[PDB]
Structure formats: C-alpha cells, structure tokens
Amino acid sequence: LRYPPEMPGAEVKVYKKVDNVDLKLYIYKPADWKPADRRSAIVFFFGGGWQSGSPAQFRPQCEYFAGRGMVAMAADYRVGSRHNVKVADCVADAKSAIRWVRQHAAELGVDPQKIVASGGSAGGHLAACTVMVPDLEAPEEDHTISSQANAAILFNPVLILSREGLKEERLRERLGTEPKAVSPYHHIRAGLPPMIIFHGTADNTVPFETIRLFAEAMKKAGNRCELVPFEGAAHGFFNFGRGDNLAYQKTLELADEFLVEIGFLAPK
C-alpha cells in the first residue's frame, strides 16, 4: 500500500475540513446509478494502528461491492504519523464520514438507513465506534443528523481498549480520552445495528478471545453479531493478496450473504 493512495475511477469528495486538512471519500458507484436510487452504502476505514495505513487497502472491496449495486467508498481519516491526532480524533473523523454520507444521501443515491460501516483492525475499531460508541462527535457538525451506521462489517477489529475488568501508559497517551470512552466492548447494549466479524484464531495483535467475548455478550443483548473464525489465521489474513485471496474471497462471500441477510443487497 501507498499513501497518498491511487484510486482510479473513484469519485473524490471532501467530507470534512479540519485543521486545514481536506479529508476525502473515494466513492465507487454501480453501473445503473442515478441520483434518485436508494441503494445501500458501505464506508471502509483502513487499518494501521491509528498512526498509518491507506484508503487503498479496501479499494478492491469497494470495486466488488459497487459491482454488486452498492455505493462503496473508502474514507481517509487523520492518523498519528501524519496529523497531530489521538484515537478519539480518528473516531470523530469516522463519525463525520457516516454523517456526511447520510446528510448527502439524496445526491449519493443512497438510502440514509442502509449505510454500512466497515474496516480492518484500527479501522474496524472505528467502524464499530460508529455503531455503538457514543459521543466523540465533531463539535461543529449538525448533531441532529445521526452519525450512527445501520450495520457493520468488521475485519479483525480492535474491540477492547480498557483493562477495566478481569484477565499500558503508551496506550492511554495515544487515546485522547479515558480508555473506556473509545472501547466498543464497554458499550455493549441492546438494540444495536447488525454486524458480522471476521477474526483469526491465531491473531497475536488482537486476541481472538477478546472478540468471542464481545460477540457472546452481544448476543445475550439480543443483537445480530456473527463471528466467522478463520482457523489458524493471523492479523491481516483477509487482505487482498494474502495467500492467494482465499480469505479475501471468503470474507467477501460471507459479507455479501450477510448484506442480503439483512436486506441491504439483492440476490445474484
């Protein structure tokens, strides 16, 4: 991956101006697109530990889902190696992206109620923050337009950020807030949007146990929260180019059937 990314064929829209930085959405429209459609949308957040990464990471997935009838985009967001930000600022950026898409749903040809948030690792964390973590919103935006996504597709996300529980200072200094405030696990509750999670059993960056604990506690609250374990796979397994795209093709396959499952996508 490179940054700045190369995104051929994508339409470029600035969704947020902050610190004189113009944060961009790379939008991939389907074939039979008109401003009057009400298609589902998916917004991808790249990974890279809230410090690096590139919107090009999920460009392959955008092209796939746009070919399947969605308005697919990859969001840029501020990161530590480029901008003076902490994790809490990254969350505000991800929320701005969802709010912007909903605010512009009419011109995007999008159903404001079928907006999916998605991401890998740190960007999987952000996507989950847009469905279940409160506040951390850009203070000058219209809070009467909801920043909450309607579904989430998570690729080995980080879901537990605070040790407030059973079983360090470097982390608290890159968070920009109390650890619980940026931790999806400590905001599990009933009535949350549906979601599907792809995680590796041998993940040594984000332990699989932290995700299975999240998913179980999410089911006892009545939410749709499906784990798809990938046996022996490690952090990053899903990415286009890993092995020979067996995980990439299967994650796309199980994500497609999940969007059909909740009604955001039409059968083939």
Residue numbers in the entry: 6 to 172, 181 to 281
Give excerpts from the publication.
The orthorhombic crystals of TtEst2 of the uninhibited or apo state were obtained in conditions different that the ones previously reported by Sayer et al., where PEG 600 was used as a precipitating agent under microbatch conditions. A major difference can be observed compared to the model reported by Sayer et al. with the region comprising residues 172 to 181 that could not be modeled due to the absence of electron density. The region 165–190 is mostly disordered with high B-factors. Thus, these residues certainly explore a wider spatial range, and such dynamic disorder could explain the polydispersity of the solution measured by SEC-MALS, by mimicking multiple species. Tetrahedral-shaped electron density close to the active site was observed in a feature-enhanced map, and modeled as a sulfate molecule. However, in our apo structure, there was clearly no density allowing modeling of a whole HEPES molecule. The residues forming the catalytic triad are in an optimal configuration, with a 2.9 Å H-bond between Ser126 and His248, and a 2.9 Å H-bond between His248 and Asp216 (not shown). A water molecule sits at optimal H-bond distance between the catalytic serine, Ser126, and the main chain amide nitrogen atoms of residues Gly53 and Gly54 which form the oxyanion hole.
In order to facilitate the purification costs, we searched the ESTHER database for a thermophilic esterase, and identified the Esterase 2 from Thermogutta terrifontis (TtEst2) that has been previously structurally characterized, and presents an open active site that could ease protein engineering for further optimizations. The recombinant protein was purified, biochemically characterized, and its kinetic behavior towards different OPNA studied, before performing a structural analysis of its complexes formed when soaked in a racemic solution of the OPNA. Biophysical characterizations demonstrated that TtEst2 is a monomer in solution, with some polydispersity and good thermostability at physiological pH. We determined the bimolecular inhibition rate constants for five representative OPNA, namely tabun, sarin, cyclosarin, VX, and paraoxon, to estimate if this enzyme could scavenge them at a fast pace.
